[PDB]
C-alpha cells in the first residue's frame, strides 16, 4: 500500500524586470540675420 | 464498455503585458549675441 504526502510546495514567478540609463549632450548654434524698412 | 467524461474546462489566456515608467533631467545653456545696426 503505497501513498504520497507532500511536505511544502514552492512558487517561482515567472517575471522580466528591465532597467536602463543614459546620457546626452549637445551643442546647437544659430547665425540669425534681420533686414527692418518703413 | 470504458467511456470518458468531462467534469470542467479551464481556459489559460496566452496574453503578454508590459509596465514601464520613466524620469528624465535636463538642462540648457544659451549665450546669445546681437549686433543692431540702425
Tied chains: 1, 2.
Excluded: C, P, Y
Amino acid at each position: 500500500i503505497v501513498g504520497v504526502g507532500m511536505e511544502k510546495l514552492i512558487i517561482s514567478t515567472n517575471e522580466h524586470a528591465s532597467t536602463d540609463q543614459g546620457k546626452t549632450v549637445s551643442r546647437a548654434t544659430t547665425n540669425s540675420k534681420t533686414e527692418s524698412n518703413t
